[PDB]
Ligand binder design. Structure first.
Ligand SMILES: CCCCCCCCCCCCCCCCCC(=O)OC[C@H](CO[C@@H]1O[C@H](CO[C@H]2O[C@H](CO)[C@H](O)[C@H](O)[C@H]2O)[C@H](O)[C@H](O)[C@H]1O)OC(=O)CCCCCCCCCCCCCCCCC
Ligand SMILES: CCCCCCCCCCCCCCCCCC(=O)OC[C@H](CO[C@@H]1O[C@H](CO[C@H]2O[C@H](CO)[C@H](O)[C@H](O)[C@H]2O)[C@H](O)[C@H](O)[C@H]1O)OC(=O)CCCCCCCCCCCCCCCCC
Ligand code: CLA
Ligand code: CLA
Ligand code: CLA
Ligand code: CLA
Ligand code: CLA
Ligand SMILES: CCCCCCCCCCCCCCCC(=O)OC[C@H](COP(=O)(O)OC[C@@H](O)CO)OC(=O)CCCCCCCCCCCCCCC
Ligand SMILES: CC1=C(/C=C/C(C)=C/C=C/C(C)=C/C=C/C=C(C)/C=C/C=C(C)/C=C/C2=C(C)CCCC2(C)C)C(C)(C)CCC1
Ligand SMILES: CC1=C(/C=C/C(C)=C/C=C/C(C)=C/C=C/C=C(C)/C=C/C=C(C)/C=C/C2=C(C)CCCC2(C)C)C(C)(C)CCC1
Ligand SMILES: CC1=C(/C=C/C(C)=C/C=C/C(C)=C/C=C/C=C(C)/C=C/C=C(C)/C=C/C2=C(C)CCCC2(C)C)C(C)(C)CCC1
Ligand code: OEX
Ligand SMILES: [Cl-]
Ligand SMILES: [Cl-]
Ligand SMILES: [Fe+2]
Lengths: 30, 451, 62, 36, 334, 34, 341, 36, 30, 37
């Protein structure tokens, strides 16, 4: 149960990277 | 004025040697001044080492770096590396020192009175950084000079007394080299060797035949390319790929010295042919190999069968095997089974170390050579306390291998920083945003958004 | 020859020490670039003579 | 193992040639600026 | 035009979400190779004999580790500095037993990490920027070069490099102290002043700027909405911050110039970490820290211990215990 | 024109006077034979 | 108009070195803590408390000089000069470690004075007191390490000693006895220090490489005057650079400079909590599942067990002299040692 | 208010500190704290 | 002995600033 | 050892290697004379 718990958290942090980059809030100028 | 303040030159005082990028005269006086400063230390440090020198002690117990450079060339040393005459060391120190004044005489002249410009004083010495032909000829000029200096080393080896050769039979001694190796399959066979364990790239050279023969290929290559770059001008593909500016050329040389800096570090640490162990001391792998043989001799004298001695790990206590099957020493020194030394090779056979010759053919000179190298392993503190980090104060010793490796790694890294600084800069100066982004023409504002 | 050496070598150092301070001061000085020039031909031309004698006369005291 | 060795030698050679001929393809002219 | 010209325009395109570049052509495959192998090794790699004495060390999660203790174990001491790719082992099972993956990871990593540094110059050149951000990144990069290659070179084996794990790094620091006394070496001391002052100057500069924001929001909403992206105005009063910090110390101990200040913030930690990288690179050739063992001694000859002699006691405890079966002889010279 | 004895005068001499005194004491210690 | 407001005016006079009401507590306490350390490391010994030499007069250098903590028999005594221990003798006061409590306590109120100095000056010039709030981390670090930790153990003896080499011994003591590297509160503290050093270098370098050309000099330092209203470096160019190189990038200057406050300040606070736990020996020393497995499987080995063997060596070899009051005597046959070494 | 140049005192005070610290580094090899 | 080393390093060390001082008084090209 | 004819110059050769360092120090005395222009 431990090994599944560590890799599951690791996978969420990697999935969090994909959204924080390609689905960020666009910075716009004015 | 004369570009000696920030208002006129644009550079501050902490970057003011850059006020000479287009002052060929004052810049000529700066290099020859710095050239005389090296020649000065070359002679002033050698006479200091000779003054503090003692023949009875080994050179590595006295903190010398250049006397071994003179001794390796065969000047002043006899059989076994023993010093027989200190007069050659004295001449090298004085001639390098007396010569320090003449360049210092001209380096000060070309910098204080000499024409701050030479383009109107002489068409031959005046140059333009953008002049691709004038630059390749100065490169070709100095190539021939360095090519001649390469043939000076072999001139010493083949015609003027020879070189000290640690691999000489029956003990180290100076020997005239009569058959320099010129085979390109061997000389250029070094450049393609892996730089990993067991291979060593060009650090693996282990005979003065290959050292001498390699230096004469370099001698002519620098003469051929020297004449080549005098009679040629860079092709089309060479002009659209490089930056042609005064600082860009400096950055190309910084990255070249950095590479040569790291190469020399691994040389003195691993190589024991051109850096003899009788002068600089045993290497890292050498001294660790010497400890394994020191205790083989001791325990075998008392009745131990070293061949069948099983250590606690299951591997041999004194002898084991390399991953390819060669019989090597046991312990932590298994990593150093690639070491080759004249005090150990007599016991090496077709399949590694020979157990029979170990029982019968070990000589008392090998027992002292192994003990001496064991007690002079390149380990020491910054305040020069010999031994491991937990040793107590007594033996004043760190190996010249340590001073030479650590110092020339610090420089090689800092020059790699110098390349990165000056090379990325010459790019930004050749473009021309090296001082900031233009406000009314900021490039990023004209580009599409990323999202 | 015997002592005509520690006098010539000590005179070599004394001349070397006065120029090293004397040459560069003469160097950036527009006091007398012709008056202050021939003492540089003399000293340097004499400096070469003093190193040439101390060198070849060396061999009689070595 | 020898088959894998040839593949890596080809892959590595393919990417290092894209690197050398990439900079040689007029890199200093690729700047938002003066192009020469 | 031709396809090669169109390809070169795409590699150097400033409109890509993630810039590729010619350095990126090398960086992307080398990094992707290193992480994919690292992730798989950290989870399911079998035990590895690092010290070459037929004593494997478990390092993966499936073999009884957690995030704190798991590690990718360095290659065997029987290999030393020898190049050990997959095709030099008679199979994968032999490759995993001798610490094969460790070499493949650190090699593809240091390669991609160096191209990452050049990639910083490359995009700076295409955007009209000054180029010296890569120089600041050279300090952490040279640090990675020291503990992963420069030190295994000087000692002669990759088994002595820093493991790829949390507890593995702790094992690297303790042994390095017993054999080199890194705490008494000045370069590590300069490295501590770089990281302590780096965090000090980070908290300071961050506080003083957040102490003098122009009031442009209410109390109900966040203060960050007083700044808008791309505005020409500076959202904090610089001379107001100079008037505060200049009175805490004295007037001339404060930076009135913004460019001189951010240079100091970049200079201090970078050259400081440069030294602690050079400290590891020099102690690789066994030029260790200051040795003051038994350096004070009384009028008779009794050793009057100092705080340095106590440090020598803790060092002796680590040295006699590390790699408890790897040694057969009284001296540990590598 | 300018004053001489200020609070800046006291702050300087509180650290300058003992420092030179300590630099002399530590100097004499370099010749202490055991 | 009274004497209070007259004294208030004099303290807040804009002079070269600002005094203020906070100075009455800051200046005398900061001058005695430092001067006490300089007096100790130059002249004072620690022979009767630790069995060590620790002054320049005895032959120590800048690295080994220290003001050692008092002996273990003194307990948590304040060791006042007029107290029941020294009984007014200044010589015997130095010989038992009175200077250590003289430096720790005067230095503690000195830190309080300096933080009050940050609140007082911030009010006079009309700024936000975020600099004072950031100084709370170095104070929580000093209190937990030099005061809360020794109060949890046996005496002031096991507190840090004011010396360069005495601090290195403090860390090795925490490795061998506490396994302080394994504690997750030191790990977060490490991340707050190395992270703040990362931000400090990457922010200053990004500013230096995204500036506008506001001048005609090759050294771009003179192109700035403090009284502008425009930004000296491009924020939108630095955002695009880091968006394409790293993936994300800052887009708000006010958030960026607050983030540089939060990361290093929070890191030190977390490491202070971990030391407060160690005062009671509440350590993160072991993983029970590992030890249950390794005790019954003589082939299971991880870097965790290798480090514990190193901890067992540090304790058994440094204890007899680092803790001389215990009168430890270990024969040669009980000392944990590997093979050969 | 400046009858003696600042660069002169800068060198004198600079040469003055070079000697005093060198006296300290020298003392590391003689007398107490020299291990001998 | 010791004095012989210190006597001359003082002369070598004074020679430097002497050059900058001599032309400062004679208004040389500094 | 050195020679014996050059033996009187032992304290002189003991200080010569440091001379290169002084040229770098001279650049700051000489620029402090011009005021860091
Ligand atoms: C343009 C740039 C292009 C770069 C592209 C990348 C190209 C490949 C680079 C390879 C990187 C080197 C890795 C392995 C280096 C190493 O194991 O090098 C060690 C070898 C020495 O090899 C040793 O050589 C020895 C040779 O000795 C033998 O021969 C001797 C002969 O006397 C003695 O007899 C001795 O006893 C005997 O054993 C043995 O073979 C050893 O087994 C073998 O390890 O050195 C060498 O090949 C020479 C030195 C190699 C360079 C040193 C690396 C420095 C890099 C630092 C980078 C820092 C970056 C910081 C960035 C910020
Ligand atoms: C924060 C930001 C602001 C910064 C603040 C600035 C710092 C101001 C200076 C603070 C001064 C603190 C002095 C504390 C001295 C102390 O405590 O002195 C210690 C004494 C207790 O004395 C000890 O008591 C021990 C217990 O003994 C008892 O038990 C023994 C066992 O049988 C025997 O019976 C013995 O006779 C009996 O007395 C031993 O005797 C020790 O030798 C003796 O030193 O308590 C006492 O004075 C009183 C203790 C009760 C008050 C506790 C509050 C202070 C401590 C808070 C931290 C507690 C945390 C514990 C660690 C977790
Ligand atoms: C072949 C070598 C070489 C050459 C000729 C140059 C030439 C130049 N560089 Mg470069 N540089 C080099 C290598 C070189 N560099 C290396 C290796 C690095 C990396 C460390 C740098 C980093 C660098 C930077 C960062 C900058 C330059 C700049 C410059 C220009 C002005 C430099 C100047 O005025 O110095 C002034 C000299 C000093 C201020 C003295 C510095 C003293 C150092 C820091 C300490 C010495 C250490 C020593 C071991 C200890 C001293 C002992 C002490 C106790 C007395 C000039 C064109 C500047 C530029 O861009 O110009 C356009 C600039 O900003 N250089
Ligand atoms: C070996 C290193 C080196 C060299 C060769 C030079 C050389 C030079 N520098 Mg540089 N510089 C250096 C280090 C060096 N510097 C360092 C470390 C710094 C940082 C502190 C600087 C900062 C700097 C700035 C900011 C500037 C220079 C300038 C100059 C040039 C003009 C010198 C002048 O007019 O002085 C005039 C000074 C005098 C007349 C006083 C006497 C000086 C002499 C030369 C001393 C020599 C004494 C010596 C013992 C005599 C030889 C013995 C004899 C027997 C042979 C000159 C080519 C300037 C320039 O670019 O010119 C256009 C300039 O603006 N330098
Ligand atoms: C790289 C070094 C270098 C370079 C490029 C120059 C270049 C120049 N110098 Mg300079 N000079 C140098 C070193 C250098 N010098 C040194 C070391 C000294 C001290 C002795 C001088 C002293 C000096 C003075 C006093 C004067 C010049 C002048 C000149 C200019 C005229 C040259 C001429 O008429 O020669 C014509 C060519 C010849 C006479 C042929 C000579 C061939 C050489 C000497 C034979 C041996 C060379 C050999 C290969 C090098 C030995 C290598 C060794 C260092 C290892 C010219 C710009 C003059 C000037 O500016 O005009 C007014 C001037 O008055 N120089
Ligand atoms: C100090 C030495 C030196 C320097 C700086 C130069 C500089 C130059 N030469 Mg010259 N050259 C030299 C010596 C030198 N030369 C000598 C001695 C010879 C005689 C053999 C020549 C013969 C020569 C010819 C025939 C030509 C040049 C050309 C050039 C120009 C292009 C350089 C270039 O593109 O390199 C970049 C190099 C490459 C793109 C080659 C590929 C890079 C390889 C694959 C990298 C491998 C390195 C690796 C990391 C380690 C290598 C070790 C081992 C594996 C081999 C440049 C001005 C050209 C020109 O325009 O001049 C008219 C030209 O046609 N050179
Ligand atoms: C703001 C300045 C300041 C502060 C906060 C401190 C704080 C401290 N000092 Mg320090 N000290 C200072 C300045 C300061 N010092 C200066 C300038 C000197 C130089 C002379 C010293 C010299 C010094 C020494 C030599 C020692 C201390 C010590 C101490 C500690 C104990 C003090 C104590 O119990 O006093 C108690 C006094 C009070 C609480 C004052 C309260 C008085 C009120 C108003 C009532 C008045 C009574 C009234 C007159 C009736 C008379 C009583 C009658 C019945 C007899 C404490 C940490 C001791 C220490 O650190 O030991 C480890 C110690 O030995 N101090
Ligand atoms: C022995 C150690 C050698 C240290 C070398 C000097 C350290 C300076 C470099 C630090 C790297 C900082 C990260 C980049 C930070 C960065 O980009 O800094 C840039 C900063 C500002 O440079 P400017 O472009 O204004 O001008 C400096 C030169 O470029 C002259 O044009 O450079 C300097 O201050 C150079 C001064 C060195 C003089 C000393
Ligand atoms: C430009 C410049 C600079 C630089 C300078 C230089 C770099 C110079 C050099 C100089 C030099 C480079 C010099 C040299 C000199 C030399 C000499 C002067 C020598 C002498 C010798 C002698 C006298 C010897 C003797 C002897 C003998 C003979 C025998 C044995 C014994 C004896 C050793 C004693 C600077 C930075 C400052 C700044 C400004 C500008
Ligand atoms: C405790 C006590 C007290 C107090 C005292 C005091 C307050 C003292 C002070 C003292 C002091 C106030 C001292 C000082 C000292 C100082 C010093 C000792 C310094 C030195 C230094 C030097 C020598 C320098 C060095 C350096 C540096 C820093 C940097 C770089 C360079 C050099 C290396 C040079 C009293 C009686 C009140 C009461 C009771 C007890
Ligand atoms: C070999 C020989 C010779 C030669 C010698 C020479 C060549 C010398 C040179 C000399 C030199 C060339 C010297 C120099 C010196 C320098 C100095 C002594 C400097 C000092 C420095 C300082 C002290 C600085 C200060 C400062 C300032 C000014 C400002 C800023 C800050 C400071 C603090 C950094 C003769 C002839 C005797 C003869 C015998 C043999
Ligand atoms: O492997 Mn990892 O650690 Ca460098 O010392 Mn030797 O080897 Mn082992 O013992 Mn100590
Ligand atoms: Cl271990
Ligand atoms: Cl062993
Ligand atoms: Fe900022």
């Amino acid at each position: 149960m431990e090994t599944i718990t560590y890799v599951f958290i690791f996978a969420c942090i990697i999935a969090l990277f994909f959204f924080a980059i390609f689905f960020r809030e666009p910075p716009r100028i004015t | 004025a004369t570009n000696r303040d920030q208002e006129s030159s644009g550079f501050a005082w902490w970057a003011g040697n850059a006020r000479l990028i287009n002052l060929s005269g004052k810049l000529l006086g700066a290099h020859v001044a710095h050239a005389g400063l090296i020649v000065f230390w070359a002679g002033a440090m050698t006479l200091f080492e000779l003054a503090h020198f003692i023949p009875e002690k080994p050179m590595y117990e006295q903190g010398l770096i250049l006397i071994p450079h003179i001794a390796t060339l065969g000047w002043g040393v006899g059989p076994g590396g023993e010093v027989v005459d200190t007069f050659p060391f004295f001449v090298v120190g004085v001639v390098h020192l007396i010569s320090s004044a003449v360049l210092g005489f001209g380096g000060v002249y070309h910098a204080i009175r000499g024409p701050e410009t030479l383009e109107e004083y002489s068409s031959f010495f005046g140059y333009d950084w953008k002049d691709k032909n004038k630059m390749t000829t100065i490169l070709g000029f100095h190539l021939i000079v360095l090519g001649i200096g390469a043939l000076l080393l072999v001139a010493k080896a083949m015609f003027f007394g020879g070189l000290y050769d640690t691999w000489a039979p029956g003990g180290g001694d100076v020997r005239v080299i009569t058959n320099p190796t010129l085979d390109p399959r061997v000389i250029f066979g070094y450049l393609l060797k892996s730089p990993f364990g067991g291979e060593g790239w060009i650090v693996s050279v282990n005979n003065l035949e290959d050292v001498v023969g390699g230096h004469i290929w370099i001698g002519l290559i620098c003469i051929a390319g020297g004449i080549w770059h005098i009679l040629t001008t860079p092709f089309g593909w060479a002009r659209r790929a490089f930056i042609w500016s005064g600082e860009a050329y400096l950055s190309y040389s910084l990255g070249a010295l950095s590479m040569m800096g790291f190469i020399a570090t691994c040389f003195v640490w691993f190589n024991n042919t051109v850096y003899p162990s009788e002068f600089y001391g045993p290497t890292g792998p050498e001294a660790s190999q010497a400890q394994a043989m020191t205790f083989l001799i001791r325990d075998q004298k008392l009745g131990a069968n070293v061949g069948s001695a099983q250590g606690p790990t299951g591997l041999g206590k004194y002898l084991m095997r390399s991953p390819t099957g060669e019989i090597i020493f046991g312990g932590e020194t298994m990593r150093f089974w690639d070491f080759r030394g004249p005090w150990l090779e007599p016991l090496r056979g077709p399949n590694g170390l020979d157990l029979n010759k170990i029982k019968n053919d070990i000589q008392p000179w090998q027992e002292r050579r192994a003990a001496e190298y064991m007690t002079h392993a390149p380990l020491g503190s910054l305040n020069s306390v010999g031994g491991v980090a937990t040793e107590i104060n007594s033996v004043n010793f760190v190996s010249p291998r340590s001073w030479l490796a650590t110092s020339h790694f610090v420089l090689a890294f800092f020059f790699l920083v110098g390349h990165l600084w000056h090379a990325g800069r010459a790019r930004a100066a050749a473009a021309g945003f090296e001082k900031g982004i233009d406000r009314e023409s900021e490039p990023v504002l004209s580009m599409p958004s990323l999202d | 020859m015997t002592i005509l050496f520690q006098l010539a070598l000590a005179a070599l150092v004394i001349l070397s020490f006065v120029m090293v301070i004397g040459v560069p001061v003469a160097y950036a000085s527009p006091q007398d670039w012709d008056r202050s020039k021939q003492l540089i031909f003399l000293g340097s031309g004499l400096w070469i003579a003093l190193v040439l004698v101390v060198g070849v006369l060396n061999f009689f005291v070595v | 193992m020898e088959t894998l060795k040839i593949t890596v030698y080809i892959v590595v050679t393919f990417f290092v040639l894209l690197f050398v001929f990439g900079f040689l393809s007029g890199d200093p002219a690729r700047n938002p600026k003066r192009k020469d | 035009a031709n396809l090669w010209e169109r390809f070169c325009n795409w590699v150097t395109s400033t409109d890509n979400r993630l810039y590729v570049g010619w350095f990126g052509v090398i960086m992307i495959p080398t990094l992707l190779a290193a992480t994919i192998c690292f992730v798989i090794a950290f989870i399911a790699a079998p035990p590895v004999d690092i010290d070459g004495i037929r004593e494997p060390v478990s390092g993966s999660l499936l073999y009884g580790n957690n995030i704190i203790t798991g590690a990718v174990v360095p290659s065997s001491n029987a290999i030393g500095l020898h190049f050990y790719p997959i095709w030099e082992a008679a199979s994968l099972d032999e490759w995993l037993y001798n610490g094969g993956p460790y070499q493949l990871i650190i090699f593809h990593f240091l390669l991609g990490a160096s191209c990452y540094m050049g990639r910083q110059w490359e995009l700076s050149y295409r955007l009209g920027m000054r180029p010296w951000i890569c120089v600041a990144y050279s300090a952490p990069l040279a640090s990675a070069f020291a503990v992963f290659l420069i030190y295994p070179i000087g000692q002669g084996s990759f088994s002595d490099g820093m493991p790829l794990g949390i507890s593995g790094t702790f094992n690297f620091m303790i042994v390095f102290q017993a054999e080199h006394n890194i705490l008494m070496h000045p370069f590590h001391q300069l490295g501590v002043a770089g990281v302590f002052g780096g965090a000090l100057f980070c908290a300071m500069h961050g506080s003083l700027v957040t102490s003098s924001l122009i009031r442009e929001t209410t109390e109900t909403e966040s203060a960050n909405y007083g700044y808008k992206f791309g505005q020409e105005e500076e959202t904090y009063n610089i001379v107001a911050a100079h008037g505060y910090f200049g009175r805490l110390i004295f007037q001339y101990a404060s930076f009135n110039n913004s460019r001189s200040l951010h240079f100091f913030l970049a200079a201090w930690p970078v050259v400081g970490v440069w030294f602690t990288a050079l400290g590891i690179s020099t102690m690789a050739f066994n030029l260790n820290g200051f040795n003051f063992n038994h350096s004070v001694i009384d009028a008779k000859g009794n050793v009057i211990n100092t705080w340095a002699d106590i440090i020598n006691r803790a060092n002796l405890g680590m040295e006699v215990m590390h790699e408890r079966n790897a040694h057969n002889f009284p001296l540990d010279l590598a | 024109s300018y004053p001489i004895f200020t609070v800046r005068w006291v702050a300087v001499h509180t650290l300058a006077v003992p420092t030179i005194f300590f630099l002399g004491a530590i100097a004499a210690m370099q010749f202490i034979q055991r | 108009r009274g004497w209070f407001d007259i004294l208030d005016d004099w303290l807040k006079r804009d002079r070269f070195v600002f005094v203020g009401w906070s100075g009455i507590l800051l200046f005398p306490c900061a001058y005695l803590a430092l001067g006490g350390w300089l007096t100790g490391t130059t002249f004072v010994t620690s022979w009767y408390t630790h069995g060590l030499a620790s002054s320049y007069l005895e032959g120590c250098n800048f690295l080994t000089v220290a003001v050692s903590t008092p002996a273990n028999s003194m307990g948590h005594s304040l060791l006042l000069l007029w107290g029941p221990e020294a009984q007014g003798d200044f010589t015997r006061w130095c010989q038992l470690g009175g200077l250590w409590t003289f430096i720790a306590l005067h230095g503690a109120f000195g830190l309080i004075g300096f933080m009050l100095r940050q609140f007082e000056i911030a009010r006079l010039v009309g700024v936000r007191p975020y600099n004072a709030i950031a100084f709370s981390a170095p104070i929580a670090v000093f209190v937990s390490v030099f005061l809360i930790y020794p109060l949890g153990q046996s005496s002031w003896f096991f507190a840090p000693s004011f010396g360069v080499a005495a601090i290195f011994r403090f860390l090795l003591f925490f490795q061998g006895f506490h396994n302080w590297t394994l504690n997750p509160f030191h790990m977060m503290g490490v991340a707050g220090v190395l992270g703040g050093a990362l931000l400090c270098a990457i922010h200053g370098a990004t500013v230096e490489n995204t500036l506008f050309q506001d001048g005609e000099g090759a050294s771009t330092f003179r192109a700035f005057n403090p009284t502008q209203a425009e930004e000296t470096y491009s924020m939108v160019t630095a955002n695009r650079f880091w968006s394409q190189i790293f993936g994300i990038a800052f887009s708000n200057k006010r958030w960026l400079h607050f983030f540089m406050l939060f990361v290093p300040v929070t890191g030190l606070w977390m490491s202070a909590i971990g030391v407060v736990g160690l005062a009671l020996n509440l350590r993160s020393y072991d993983f029970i599942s590992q030890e249950i497995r390794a005790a019954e499987d003589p082939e299971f080995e991880t870097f965790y067990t290798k480090n514990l063997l190193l901890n067992e060596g540090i304790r058994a070899w440094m204890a007899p002299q680092d803790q001389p009051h215990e009168n430890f005597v270990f024969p040669e046959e009980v000392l944990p040692r590997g093979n050969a070494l | 208010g400046g009858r003696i140049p600042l660069w002169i005192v800068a060198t004198v005070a600079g040469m003055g500190v070079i000697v005093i610290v060198g006296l300290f580094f020298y003392g590391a090899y003689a007398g107490l704290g020299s291990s001998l | 002995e010791v004095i012989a080393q210190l006597t001359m390093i003082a002369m070598i060390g004074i020679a430097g600033p002497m050059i900058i001082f001599l032309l400062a008084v004679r208004r040389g090209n500094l | 050892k050195l020679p014996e004819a050059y033996a009187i110059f032992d304290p002189l050769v003991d200080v010569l290697p440091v001379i290169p360092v002084l040229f770098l120090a001279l650049a700051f005395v000489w620029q402090a004379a011009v005021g860091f222009r």
